Enzyme design. Structure first.
Site, PDB file in Angstrom:
ATOM      1  N   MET A   1      -6.858  -9.560  14.823  1.00 33.87           N
ATOM      2  CA  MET A   1      -6.906  -8.101  14.718  1.00 33.87           C
ATOM      3  C   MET A   1      -7.317  -7.746  13.283  1.00 33.87           C
ATOM      4  O   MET A   1      -6.980  -6.669  12.766  1.00 33.87           O
ATOM      5  CB  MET A   1      -5.560  -7.484  15.040  1.00 33.87           C
ATOM      6  CG  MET A   1      -5.122  -7.823  16.440  1.00 33.87           C
ATOM      7  SD  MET A   1      -4.233  -6.507  17.219  1.00 33.87           S
ATOM      8  CE  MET A   1      -2.733  -6.556  16.253  1.00 33.87           C
TER       9      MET A   1
ATOM     10  N   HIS B   1      -5.768 -13.488   6.713  1.00 33.01           N
ATOM     11  CA  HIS B   1      -5.068 -14.224   5.653  1.00 33.01           C
ATOM     12  C   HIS B   1      -5.151 -15.726   5.923  1.00 33.01           C
ATOM     13  O   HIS B   1      -5.706 -16.144   6.947  1.00 33.01           O
ATOM     14  CB  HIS B   1      -3.608 -13.769   5.522  1.00 33.01           C
ATOM     15  CG  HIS B   1      -2.825 -13.835   6.796  1.00 33.01           C
ATOM     16  ND1 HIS B   1      -2.543 -15.024   7.436  1.00 33.01           N
ATOM     17  CD2 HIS B   1      -2.269 -12.858   7.554  1.00 33.01           C
ATOM     18  CE1 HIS B   1      -1.852 -14.779   8.535  1.00 33.01           C
ATOM     19  NE2 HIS B   1      -1.671 -13.471   8.631  1.00 33.01           N
TER      20      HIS B   1
ATOM     21  N   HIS C   1      -4.860 -17.042   9.372  1.00 36.61           N
ATOM     22  CA  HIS C   1      -6.051 -16.945  10.224  1.00 36.61           C
ATOM     23  C   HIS C   1      -7.063 -18.011   9.840  1.00 36.61           C
ATOM     24  O   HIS C   1      -7.722 -18.589  10.707  1.00 36.61           O
ATOM     25  CB  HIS C   1      -6.724 -15.571  10.117  1.00 36.61           C
ATOM     26  CG  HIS C   1      -5.855 -14.438  10.554  1.00 36.61           C
ATOM     27  ND1 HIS C   1      -5.120 -13.679   9.664  1.00 36.61           N
ATOM     28  CD2 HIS C   1      -5.571 -13.955  11.788  1.00 36.61           C
ATOM     29  CE1 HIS C   1      -4.423 -12.776  10.334  1.00 36.61           C
ATOM     30  NE2 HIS C   1      -4.679 -12.924  11.624  1.00 36.61           N
TER      31      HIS C   1
ATOM     32  N   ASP D   1     -14.180  -7.270   3.704  1.00 35.08           N
ATOM     33  CA  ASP D   1     -13.471  -8.412   3.154  1.00 35.08           C
ATOM     34  C   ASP D   1     -13.244  -9.463   4.234  1.00 35.08           C
ATOM     35  O   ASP D   1     -13.311 -10.650   3.968  1.00 35.08           O
ATOM     36  CB  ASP D   1     -12.120  -7.987   2.582  1.00 35.08           C
ATOM     37  CG  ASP D   1     -11.305  -9.166   2.095  1.00 35.08           C
ATOM     38  OD1 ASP D   1     -10.970 -10.037   2.927  1.00 35.08           O
ATOM     39  OD2 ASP D   1     -10.998  -9.229   0.881  1.00 35.08           O
ATOM     40  N   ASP D   2     -12.957  -9.027   5.453  1.00 40.49           N
ATOM     41  CA  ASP D   2     -12.735 -10.006   6.520  1.00 40.49           C
ATOM     42  C   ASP D   2     -13.994 -10.838   6.728  1.00 40.49           C
ATOM     43  O   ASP D   2     -13.963 -12.071   6.697  1.00 40.49           O
ATOM     44  CB  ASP D   2     -12.355  -9.306   7.827  1.00 40.49           C
ATOM     45  CG  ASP D   2     -10.942  -8.745   7.815  1.00 40.49           C
ATOM     46  OD1 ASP D   2     -10.130  -9.100   6.928  1.00 40.49           O
ATOM     47  OD2 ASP D   2     -10.636  -7.951   8.728  1.00 40.49           O
TER      48      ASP D   2
ATOM     49  N   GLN E   1     -14.613 -13.437   4.164  1.00 45.68           N
ATOM     50  CA  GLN E   1     -13.812 -14.640   4.321  1.00 45.68           C
ATOM     51  C   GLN E   1     -14.459 -15.514   5.387  1.00 45.68           C
ATOM     52  O   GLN E   1     -14.601 -16.722   5.201  1.00 45.68           O
ATOM     53  CB  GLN E   1     -12.380 -14.288   4.713  1.00 45.68           C
ATOM     54  CG  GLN E   1     -11.631 -13.649   3.568  1.00 45.68           C
ATOM     55  CD  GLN E   1     -10.150 -13.571   3.827  1.00 45.68           C
ATOM     56  OE1 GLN E   1      -9.448 -14.588   3.805  1.00 45.68           O
ATOM     57  NE2 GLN E   1      -9.660 -12.359   4.085  1.00 45.68           N
TER      58      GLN E   1
ATOM     59  N   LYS F   1       2.923 -19.220  14.924  1.00 43.70           N
ATOM     60  CA  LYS F   1       3.802 -18.238  14.285  1.00 43.70           C
ATOM     61  C   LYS F   1       4.303 -17.266  15.350  1.00 43.70           C
ATOM     62  O   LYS F   1       5.489 -16.934  15.398  1.00 43.70           O
ATOM     63  CB  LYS F   1       3.050 -17.470  13.194  1.00 43.70           C
ATOM     64  CG  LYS F   1       3.953 -16.496  12.460  1.00 43.70           C
ATOM     65  CD  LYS F   1       3.211 -15.670  11.432  1.00 43.70           C
ATOM     66  CE  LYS F   1       4.164 -14.623  10.827  1.00 43.70           C
ATOM     67  NZ  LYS F   1       4.819 -13.751  11.850  1.00 43.70           N
TER      68      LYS F   1
ATOM     69  N   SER G   1       2.148 -13.518   6.769  1.00 41.39           N
ATOM     70  CA  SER G   1       1.987 -12.364   7.644  1.00 41.39           C
ATOM     71  C   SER G   1       1.582 -11.171   6.787  1.00 41.39           C
ATOM     72  O   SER G   1       2.029 -11.031   5.639  1.00 41.39           O
ATOM     73  CB  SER G   1       3.329 -12.073   8.348  1.00 41.39           C
ATOM     74  OG  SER G   1       3.487 -10.701   8.718  1.00 41.39           O
ATOM     75  N   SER G   2       0.722 -10.320   7.336  1.00 37.81           N
ATOM     76  CA  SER G   2       0.273  -9.128   6.618  1.00 37.81           C
ATOM     77  C   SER G   2       1.470  -8.273   6.211  1.00 37.81           C
ATOM     78  O   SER G   2       1.429  -7.579   5.191  1.00 37.81           O
ATOM     79  CB  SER G   2      -0.678  -8.311   7.506  1.00 37.81           C
ATOM     80  OG  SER G   2      -0.067  -8.047   8.767  1.00 37.81           O
ATOM     81  N   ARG G   3       2.552  -8.354   6.982  1.00 39.32           N
ATOM     82  CA  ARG G   3       3.763  -7.563   6.691  1.00 39.32           C
ATOM     83  C   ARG G   3       4.569  -7.956   5.465  1.00 39.32           C
ATOM     84  O   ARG G   3       5.378  -7.149   4.968  1.00 39.32           O
ATOM     85  CB  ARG G   3       4.717  -7.599   7.875  1.00 39.32           C
ATOM     86  CG  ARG G   3       4.218  -6.868   9.082  1.00 39.32           C
ATOM     87  CD  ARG G   3       5.203  -7.054  10.204  1.00 39.32           C
ATOM     88  NE  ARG G   3       4.541  -6.945  11.491  1.00 39.32           N
ATOM     89  CZ  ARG G   3       5.145  -7.084  12.664  1.00 39.32           C
ATOM     90  NH1 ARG G   3       6.448  -7.339  12.720  1.00 39.32           N
ATOM     91  NH2 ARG G   3       4.438  -6.960  13.782  1.00 39.32           N
TER      92      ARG G   3
HETATM   93  C1  LIG Z   1      -3.947 -12.395  19.955  1.00 38.89           C
HETATM   94  C2  LIG Z   1      -4.314 -11.016  19.390  1.00 38.89           C
HETATM   95  C3  LIG Z   1      -5.616 -11.109  18.531  1.00 38.89           C
HETATM   96  C4  LIG Z   1      -4.528 -10.048  20.538  1.00 38.89           C
HETATM   97  O1  LIG Z   1      -4.886  -8.724  20.119  1.00 38.89           O
HETATM   98  C5  LIG Z   1      -3.130 -10.437  18.500  1.00 38.89           C
HETATM   99  O2  LIG Z   1      -1.900 -10.314  19.265  1.00 38.89           O
HETATM  100  C6  LIG Z   1      -2.859 -11.398  17.270  1.00 38.89           C
HETATM  101  O3  LIG Z   1      -3.591 -11.324  16.238  1.00 38.89           O
HETATM  102  O4  LIG Z   1      -1.864 -12.281  17.385  1.00 38.89           O
END
Ligand SMILES: CC(C)(CO)[C@@H](O)C(=O)[O-]
Ligand SMILES: CC(C)(CO)[C@@H](O)C(=O)[O-]
Lengths: 287, 287
Positions: free
Chosen positions: A39, A43, A46, A87-88, A91, A159, A195-197
């Protein structure tokens, strides 16, 4: 005509039909299409998914970037969600990714919410408690991404373990011909799951947040003494931290069913620090 | 690849077997056509088979599976007609090369876990008194499409609402398959063919002609508008002995949240004793 594809470069496509056509053409050319759903707001976590996909011989990596409104609670904040498109994509270029799929909400849901995926009962548990419609949203968009891209393998982070398990159920239940690959959680130096959070935590909260991973790892090692020892150890560590409201701490089998008093399992935890909800989980071997 | 004999009917029960054979065929250039059925085959199903067989380079797969998920109660499920030997004899006579006859265990090894939630249309018409019926149909059709991976899938227009819902399924989940609707095959007097017609005694069979007569009367009355069309159909049904109308509705062709505007579909469901019959027809208003 098949849309243009420039090997060795990051090719961005917004139209589902375009990425569908390129993916099909590439698979017929000797490539194995790997899908990494995201989404955005990328980071290191990903990037580990990207690297896992890249290492498959003959791979052409497709990274989807789509903030799926269907998985945001009626109270979730779609608009507040971080968006760093340029930026995404930078990367991804830096990682050698050749395809980025960036659909609009309109292209993904041209008829609004109509036919959807209904997860099994596991979706109402754990994270499904506060967010009962969340996983329906996740499974629906993942199924669509799988049908659009038609990858040989799809990569998800451990995660979000419950999410991973539910996608494995989706694949088995709908007879999907794709291999699901779970990638170990990427953590900060002190163990906090990336995590972005995490950036929302103030200093006291950030120091206290180390308790989730510390509790899980202590539990993993206390497990030679049994299920109860592992649970009590994790609970003691969470209890040693201030401002950490535990929503759940559960030991289950690896498919998230009831945990045996012996064998392989997964210990999952969720807690609120101020207004930020953090999650973590770990493999556990009992006895 | 399990055994496959060209020019002969090959019967496979294992999902893995038909999936492997299908993929191997697709890989050599043959286009796979799928005709989903619940057995008890009649001329209406054979028209689907024939439509599939005329697609150049086609290999036809006919699935026969009385799907438990789309039945409300075990009574209706146990009452569904089963004529396996006649079904396979008819497939052999039509030159069908593959019959897929899965077991309930192979299709639902985990019971009802992840399923398909159809849109609002599933709660209407046939779905009104049977709220879970179309979730059962869409879940099994989704599975059949993933197992067989056909280029085109064939459905009869007789169960028109089902056909529309399947087109929604295909569009909403981005399925890469062409849905082909085949016109309803009728007996010499107009009765739509159905595996349920066997439950009409001589008197009921005679009276049942009212459904198709009502619909065709309506289609011609339509030059005078919707009310005229509906009243012509109602008059025919009202003159029929022992015909209890469930519903008679004129809708836009997509049966969706759109008012009737020019091109529509007139649908009827009626009970003759315990036998519920359906029929429908294209209607052009003022044309
Ligand atoms: C799997 C996903 C891309 C679905 O929108 C989202 O839940 C995520 O980033 O974990
Ligand atoms: C489409 C179908 C084969 C799904 O079981 C069934 O509903 C039928 O025969 O129309």
């Amino acid at each position: 005509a098949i849309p243009a594809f420039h090997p060795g470069e990051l090719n961005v496509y917004s139209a589902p039909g375009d990425v569908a056509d390129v993916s099909r053409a590439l698979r017929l050319t000797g490539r194995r299409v790997m899908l990494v759903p995201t989404m955005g707001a990328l980071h290191e976590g990903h990037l580990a998914l990207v690297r896992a996909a890249k290492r498959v011989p003959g791979s052409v990596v497709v990274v989807s970037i789509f903030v799926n409104p269907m998985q945001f609670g009626a109270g979730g904040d779609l608009d507040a969600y971080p968006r760093t498109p340029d930026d995404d994509l930078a990367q991804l270029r830096a990682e050698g990714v050749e395809i980025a799929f960036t659909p609009t909400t309109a292209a993904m849901y041209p008829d609004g919410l109509r036919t959807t995926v209904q997860p099994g009962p596991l979706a109402a548990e754990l994270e499904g408690g506060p967010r009962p419609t969340h996983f329906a949203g996740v499974l629906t968009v993942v199924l669509k991404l799988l049908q659009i891209v038609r990858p040989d393998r799809v990569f998800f982070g451990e995660k979000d373990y419950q999410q991973l398990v539910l996608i494995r159920q989706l694949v088995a239940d709908f007879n999907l011909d794709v291999a699901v690959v779970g990638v170990p959680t990427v953590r900060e130096a002190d163990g906090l799951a990336m995590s972005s959070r995490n950036r929302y935590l103030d200093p006291a909260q950030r120091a206290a947040a180390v308790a989730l991973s510390a509790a899980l790892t202590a539990a993993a090692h206390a497990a030679t003494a049994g299920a109860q020892a592992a649970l009590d150890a994790a609970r003691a560590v969470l209890d040693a931290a201030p401002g950490v409201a535990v929503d759940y701490l559960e030991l289950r089998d690896i498919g998230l069913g009831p945990m045996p008093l012996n064998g392989s399992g997964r210990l999952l935890v969720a807690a609120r620090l101020g207004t930020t909800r953090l999650l973590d989980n770990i493999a556990i071997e009992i006895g």
